[PDB]
């Protein structure tokens, strides 16, 4: 019920292969280059992990806690709020690995530095534990 | 004597429960099945930005702040609404062994249904709480209520501490106390209403409640209504039980560090989903070690465990005088409606005064009291106490039978509830239709009432099921588990 | 009624104490004075890597692990040993108003001394605890002990719960109880030995002690011997007192959070250094607000405060029945040796049984009991109760007199102890020699028994000091405070 | 008694003027240069604040706590051990200011970087609050 959804079995293994499918899909595109494949897949991943963690709030089902986490997005409500858990740290290490392979590919270019950093920036900034409930002028 | 392992939990018999961990390859495919399904939901609700027809909030003089969250209704219309043909089927007969089912269908893709005329007859059911087989309109057991019905009527128009208090009510409250072997007993209107109206009359503001992970919607709700701190321990994990139980005393409240006022434990006998029995003597041994109390819930357990079945206490052979308060129902072995509370006479009298339900709610209907009485008379000694030896034979036969057929079964082996594991959400939606083609109606358990990778189906065994009724069902399952490849187990 | 300010502390009179903060330019020069002195110490001890002559640990058959820390003896040989000529001078007379002092000197730079033969006579002292002037070998007051001395002897060879218990002991223990106005009283051998042997017989393991910053070496030591948590609050800071007192109840121990067993407070009447009186009604009002107890120490306060001086309780006019236990001595107003404990009869009887000193230590000498009795008789009614009106006149005269002379004085104005502020460590070493040239012997208080920027000198006023004795001393100080520029005050 | 010795009055003011004397002493030396005056006075200061805080342990007097802080140097025993106090932070800010003026003078040279850093390094390293009681193979 969205508090044990990443604390389940093999969700970590399935989270990789979704990205691994998404790359091999993006690898087989005709009018594309092998640097900007990695540039694309680090942008889309960090787009998903913002929209599916830090934007949508509540549950797709109905919570019998009378909607306590109605005002809380999905990152904030994992494991009933205790931050330094076994599964939040897995969700923070993984975009960094997706930052370093996209650092390895594109050969350390300047525009591939700029575009692939602010995606990795804007995903870890809400994952600061002292940024638990503060929402910037909206949502 | 079997096990006295570490906590002093003295066991007589072998325990033998089985929680087989789900396979790696099976689990990954489930999230893909939900992942494609959560994908089209955003697709479908995006298509609904212009106008399967909806309930259509009144425009006439309304359009205030909107009533529902659109997003909280996501799973009910994109995973539930697709396959909601099952677990809702109207039946039109006595829910015994063979059940006449009215047939319905939807050309609007389960958005609006329609009875044709059809009555699909002789359908073996395995999804009704009919353990001891008292759902019949025949025999002298139900006939006694007909004398009561033509005499009394069908319901008091009053309350227990008010006018409405019949001699039958006073008779039945005695009768269960001898059945349970406790001092006094008191019946209530329905089994849900018991826990939601009496648990708040026990614990107060400074109390602490140690409930299981998966109790019921009853036991959580009573714990919400009494303002009291609620703490969850893992399912049948005495080590995780004692760890909370240790820290509950050596600390107090979170804000102040005062001692707790009193603490108690909410556990059930037979958990309905993943049909399993609580490690009860390890609980009795532990509550005496830490001076806690104990609320027990024999909703499923009574009439199903112990010889001449009297709940889990006789099944462990223990005494009723160490359980501080016993609760069970009459809907789930007796074919009746309502529930009781058994306990000490000091406790019952306090709850005959502070009840929420003897003082506000109307009491039982008179003829269903008689259906409880005559059923307990056939147990206490006429389709009587031989059927519990039949059901335990039916339990133990059916439990080894699907395990050797490559299926995967949870819970204790002696538990009459048979949790059968699906994993894929499409395998939920096919299986209820598939068995219904093979003349059998079962109960499948969806996603949010489970975890993600549980999504199981469930079988209720019965003493009314004979061998030929049971083996015919075994034949039908053998095809379907082949047909859907749901042979997940390794053994 | 004067002040009822915030805590319910009801005041009758104006309070009027003065803690003038030290000037900025004065304080910086002090650290330079120590900074040059700590510099040569490392120089001097470096020179001692070859061989003012030392005590010379035995070489003969020794040189184990060495006995002392070299570094813990740093200040005693490099700041103390330089100027230790004063506060150690032998006197050879009755310590009244004029005191014959044996003269000594050292050509070895204070490392080894030598009496010449000289008896410096008629030296006005202001450093003896002779408030009510009972240090004389004349008059009928001391004459009564001579009858007691020729009769009894000079000391029991026994213990109170053992053989040694004279009628005088039983008489005196009565006599103080009427003097204090409390139920019962009990005398002890010396005033230091009282607190170090009775406070551990009161509080135990689970207790909490709230003592002042600067009590004594007595009251700390008794708090160390009873294993009990000790917490320090700021000097005469009821706000800092209540802040600890608040958190002492709303928390418990640090490890467990159990409640405390009992708590109490160690305070003194007149603090010897920085002679000041405790804000007592704000303490009585606060201990009733938090159910704490109270240990009070009238070592200096009795015979010095209140009319016909009976400690600080009559000086605030309050009742003796709210102080849970009263302690004072007989060395510091009476010219005797020993101390008492006053309290309730239930308390005294428990301490007549659990005493550490009535059961082990030998009791008082008989003739000094008589010197206590006849002194209290002259107070209770012959140099009697007129001298306390003389001393308070002498206090109030001398306290305004140095304040208008540009000196800086601490403490309450009505306090007989006069703390006179030096700051420079050389001004310590000059001032004791300087006044001794001007026929007056005083007490200077060094560094480690103070903070760093306190280093004060101290005057004990006396009722034996007349006006001409006092004004002659005022004349001598006027030169010296000019000579050393110690006119620090602005007013 | 070494726990209220830096918590006294005007000790901060007198700590400056000792250094201020020490510079004007070091400023009036004939065969010296105005860079290596600042190089010298940042070395001597950080030498003193190591030897007078982190080396000598105990009290020059005798402690009536039966020698509880006999094994504790002077930094460890300030204010009865509570680290983030009003006076320890004054003792950490001050060598940094002595690092920046010696950064300003000597004109940012390389050898004046090397020699004036490891003095400022070896003084703040023991002032880590998580380096309370750990002593490197000695003392």
PDB file of C-alpha atoms in Angstrom, chain D:
ATOM      1  CA  UNK D   1      39.838  25.740  37.184  1.00  0.00           C
ATOM      2  CA  UNK D   2      40.571  25.057  33.460  1.00  0.00           C
ATOM      3  CA  UNK D   3      36.854  24.597  32.698  1.00  0.00           C
ATOM      4  CA  UNK D   4      36.034  28.249  33.251  1.00  0.00           C
ATOM      5  CA  UNK D   5      39.307  29.717  32.058  1.00  0.00           C
ATOM      6  CA  UNK D   6      38.277  30.639  28.510  1.00  0.00           C
ATOM      7  CA  UNK D   7      34.722  31.272  29.722  1.00  0.00           C
ATOM      8  CA  UNK D   8      36.047  34.211  31.724  1.00  0.00           C
ATOM      9  CA  UNK D   9      35.794  37.938  31.038  1.00  0.00           C
ATOM     10  CA  UNK D  10      38.059  39.560  28.478  1.00  0.00           C
ATOM     11  CA  UNK D  11      40.179  36.487  27.874  1.00  0.00           C
ATOM     12  CA  UNK D  12      39.183  36.776  24.204  1.00  0.00           C
ATOM     13  CA  UNK D  13      40.318  40.385  24.174  1.00  0.00           C
ATOM     14  CA  UNK D  14      43.605  39.444  25.798  1.00  0.00           C
ATOM     15  CA  UNK D  15      44.165  36.549  23.426  1.00  0.00           C
ATOM     16  CA  UNK D  16      44.216  38.944  20.480  1.00  0.00           C
ATOM     17  CA  UNK D  17      46.691  41.378  21.978  1.00  0.00           C
ATOM     18  CA  UNK D  18      49.174  38.627  22.767  1.00  0.00           C
ATOM     19  CA  UNK D  19      49.235  37.829  19.068  1.00  0.00           C
ATOM     20  CA  UNK D  20      49.158  41.543  18.311  1.00  0.00           C
ATOM     21  CA  UNK D  21      52.212  41.992  20.490  1.00  0.00           C
ATOM     22  CA  UNK D  22      53.818  38.946  18.885  1.00  0.00           C
ATOM     23  CA  UNK D  23      53.446  40.406  15.413  1.00  0.00           C
ATOM     24  CA  UNK D  24      54.812  43.854  16.300  1.00  0.00           C
ATOM     25  CA  UNK D  25      57.721  42.087  17.972  1.00  0.00           C
ATOM     26  CA  UNK D  26      58.194  40.066  14.800  1.00  0.00           C
ATOM     27  CA  UNK D  27      57.632  43.148  12.645  1.00  0.00           C
ATOM     28  CA  UNK D  28      60.682  44.886  14.131  1.00  0.00           C
ATOM     29  CA  UNK D  29      63.368  42.403  13.094  1.00  0.00           C
ATOM     30  CA  UNK D  30      66.230  43.651  10.842  1.00  0.00           C
ATOM     31  CA  UNK D  31      67.102  40.726   8.582  1.00  0.00           C
ATOM     32  CA  UNK D  32      63.553  39.634   7.794  1.00  0.00           C
ATOM     33  CA  UNK D  33      61.024  40.325   5.059  1.00  0.00           C
ATOM     34  CA  UNK D  34      57.410  41.446   5.356  1.00  0.00           C
ATOM     35  CA  UNK D  35      56.092  38.221   3.734  1.00  0.00           C
ATOM     36  CA  UNK D  36      57.910  35.856   6.079  1.00  0.00           C
ATOM     37  CA  UNK D  37      56.837  37.866   9.097  1.00  0.00           C
ATOM     38  CA  UNK D  38      53.309  36.653   8.413  1.00  0.00           C
ATOM     39  CA  UNK D  39      54.664  33.205   7.575  1.00  0.00           C
ATOM     40  CA  UNK D  40      56.434  33.131  10.920  1.00  0.00           C
ATOM     41  CA  UNK D  41      53.524  34.376  13.000  1.00  0.00           C
ATOM     42  CA  UNK D  42      51.087  31.836  11.572  1.00  0.00           C
ATOM     43  CA  UNK D  43      53.544  29.077  12.349  1.00  0.00           C
ATOM     44  CA  UNK D  44      54.199  30.116  15.946  1.00  0.00           C
ATOM     45  CA  UNK D  45      50.534  30.701  16.772  1.00  0.00           C
ATOM     46  CA  UNK D  46      49.451  27.314  15.504  1.00  0.00           C
ATOM     47  CA  UNK D  47      52.395  25.813  17.352  1.00  0.00           C
ATOM     48  CA  UNK D  48      51.236  27.345  20.625  1.00  0.00           C
ATOM     49  CA  UNK D  49      47.624  26.376  20.169  1.00  0.00           C
ATOM     50  CA  UNK D  50      48.621  22.767  19.673  1.00  0.00           C
ATOM     51  CA  UNK D  51      50.995  22.557  22.627  1.00  0.00           C
ATOM     52  CA  UNK D  52      48.742  24.506  24.998  1.00  0.00           C
ATOM     53  CA  UNK D  53      45.525  22.755  24.062  1.00  0.00           C
ATOM     54  CA  UNK D  54      46.172  19.309  22.669  1.00  0.00           C
ATOM     55  CA  UNK D  55      49.365  18.183  24.309  1.00  0.00           C
ATOM     56  CA  UNK D  56      49.524  19.046  28.017  1.00  0.00           C
ATOM     57  CA  UNK D  57      46.919  17.140  30.009  1.00  0.00           C
ATOM     58  CA  UNK D  58      45.692  17.702  33.538  1.00  0.00           C
ATOM     59  CA  UNK D  59      45.812  20.837  35.643  1.00  0.00           C
ATOM     60  CA  UNK D  60      48.736  22.923  36.897  1.00  0.00           C
ATOM     61  CA  UNK D  61      46.988  22.881  40.266  1.00  0.00           C
ATOM     62  CA  UNK D  62      45.416  19.907  42.011  1.00  0.00           C
ATOM     63  CA  UNK D  63      41.907  18.848  41.024  1.00  0.00           C
ATOM     64  CA  UNK D  64      39.460  17.838  43.779  1.00  0.00           C
ATOM     65  CA  UNK D  65      37.792  15.468  41.281  1.00  0.00           C
ATOM     66  CA  UNK D  66      40.538  12.930  42.154  1.00  0.00           C
ATOM     67  CA  UNK D  67      42.218  13.483  38.807  1.00  0.00           C
ATOM     68  CA  UNK D  68      39.378  12.699  36.442  1.00  0.00           C
ATOM     69  CA  UNK D  69      40.903  14.791  33.656  1.00  0.00           C
ATOM     70  CA  UNK D  70      44.421  13.538  34.317  1.00  0.00           C
ATOM     71  CA  UNK D  71      44.288  11.726  30.969  1.00  0.00           C
ATOM     72  CA  UNK D  72      42.553  14.635  29.210  1.00  0.00           C
ATOM     73  CA  UNK D  73      44.200  17.522  27.432  1.00  0.00           C
ATOM     74  CA  UNK D  74      42.992  21.069  27.810  1.00  0.00           C
ATOM     75  CA  UNK D  75      40.758  21.225  24.755  1.00  0.00           C
ATOM     76  CA  UNK D  76      38.915  18.053  25.733  1.00  0.00           C
ATOM     77  CA  UNK D  77      38.132  19.351  29.202  1.00  0.00           C
ATOM     78  CA  UNK D  78      36.740  22.781  28.346  1.00  0.00           C
ATOM     79  CA  UNK D  79      33.254  23.492  29.726  1.00  0.00           C
ATOM     80  CA  UNK D  80      33.047  19.884  30.992  1.00  0.00           C
ATOM     81  CA  UNK D  81      33.216  18.441  27.492  1.00  0.00           C
ATOM     82  CA  UNK D  82      30.212  20.023  25.750  1.00  0.00           C
ATOM     83  CA  UNK D  83      31.719  20.852  22.387  1.00  0.00           C
ATOM     84  CA  UNK D  84      29.570  23.387  20.550  1.00  0.00           C
ATOM     85  CA  UNK D  85      29.927  26.160  23.107  1.00  0.00           C
ATOM     86  CA  UNK D  86      30.384  29.897  22.786  1.00  0.00           C
ATOM     87  CA  UNK D  87      34.134  29.777  23.331  1.00  0.00           C
ATOM     88  CA  UNK D  88      35.406  26.771  21.403  1.00  0.00           C
ATOM     89  CA  UNK D  89      34.045  28.272  18.196  1.00  0.00           C
ATOM     90  CA  UNK D  90      35.934  31.473  18.920  1.00  0.00           C
ATOM     91  CA  UNK D  91      39.084  29.383  19.174  1.00  0.00           C
ATOM     92  CA  UNK D  92      38.435  27.815  15.778  1.00  0.00           C
ATOM     93  CA  UNK D  93      37.514  30.967  13.866  1.00  0.00           C
ATOM     94  CA  UNK D  94      40.667  32.784  14.952  1.00  0.00           C
ATOM     95  CA  UNK D  95      43.343  30.628  13.201  1.00  0.00           C
ATOM     96  CA  UNK D  96      41.260  30.845  10.019  1.00  0.00           C
ATOM     97  CA  UNK D  97      41.489  34.627  10.204  1.00  0.00           C
ATOM     98  CA  UNK D  98      45.189  34.099  10.831  1.00  0.00           C
ATOM     99  CA  UNK D  99      45.165  31.877   7.776  1.00  0.00           C
ATOM    100  CA  UNK D 100      43.517  34.478   5.568  1.00  0.00           C
ATOM    101  CA  UNK D 101      45.754  37.396   6.481  1.00  0.00           C
ATOM    102  CA  UNK D 102      48.721  35.166   5.851  1.00  0.00           C
ATOM    103  CA  UNK D 103      46.895  34.275   2.660  1.00  0.00           C
ATOM    104  CA  UNK D 104      46.640  37.996   1.897  1.00  0.00           C
ATOM    105  CA  UNK D 105      50.262  38.654   2.733  1.00  0.00           C
ATOM    106  CA  UNK D 106      53.109  36.704   1.061  1.00  0.00           C
ATOM    107  CA  UNK D 107      51.037  37.201  -2.168  1.00  0.00           C
ATOM    108  CA  UNK D 108      49.653  33.642  -2.397  1.00  0.00           C
ATOM    109  CA  UNK D 109      52.992  31.958  -3.004  1.00  0.00           C
ATOM    110  CA  UNK D 110      53.420  28.222  -3.308  1.00  0.00           C
ATOM    111  CA  UNK D 111      55.859  27.651  -0.450  1.00  0.00           C
ATOM    112  CA  UNK D 112      53.865  30.089   1.677  1.00  0.00           C
ATOM    113  CA  UNK D 113      50.844  28.007   0.821  1.00  0.00           C
ATOM    114  CA  UNK D 114      52.544  24.762   1.850  1.00  0.00           C
ATOM    115  CA  UNK D 115      54.121  25.872   5.109  1.00  0.00           C
ATOM    116  CA  UNK D 116      51.143  27.913   6.322  1.00  0.00           C
ATOM    117  CA  UNK D 117      48.530  25.274   5.568  1.00  0.00           C
ATOM    118  CA  UNK D 118      49.785  22.244   7.493  1.00  0.00           C
ATOM    119  CA  UNK D 119      50.065  24.378  10.612  1.00  0.00           C
ATOM    120  CA  UNK D 120      46.440  25.394  10.109  1.00  0.00           C
ATOM    121  CA  UNK D 121      45.690  21.785   9.222  1.00  0.00           C
ATOM    122  CA  UNK D 122      47.277  20.159  12.268  1.00  0.00           C
ATOM    123  CA  UNK D 123      45.454  22.527  14.649  1.00  0.00           C
ATOM    124  CA  UNK D 124      41.901  22.000  13.356  1.00  0.00           C
ATOM    125  CA  UNK D 125      42.245  18.232  12.951  1.00  0.00           C
ATOM    126  CA  UNK D 126      42.152  17.624  16.743  1.00  0.00           C
ATOM    127  CA  UNK D 127      39.300  20.130  16.983  1.00  0.00           C
ATOM    128  CA  UNK D 128      36.991  17.744  15.187  1.00  0.00           C
ATOM    129  CA  UNK D 129      34.309  16.880  17.781  1.00  0.00           C
ATOM    130  CA  UNK D 130      34.332  13.240  16.653  1.00  0.00           C
ATOM    131  CA  UNK D 131      38.051  13.207  17.495  1.00  0.00           C
ATOM    132  CA  UNK D 132      37.286  13.655  21.179  1.00  0.00           C
ATOM    133  CA  UNK D 133      39.374  10.958  22.813  1.00  0.00           C
ATOM    134  CA  UNK D 134      41.307   9.180  20.058  1.00  0.00           C
ATOM    135  CA  UNK D 135      45.079   9.571  20.436  1.00  0.00           C
ATOM    136  CA  UNK D 136      47.437   8.531  17.647  1.00  0.00           C
ATOM    137  CA  UNK D 137      49.722   5.775  19.022  1.00  0.00           C
ATOM    138  CA  UNK D 138      50.838   7.907  21.972  1.00  0.00           C
ATOM    139  CA  UNK D 139      50.038  10.532  24.618  1.00  0.00           C
TER     140      UNK D 139
END
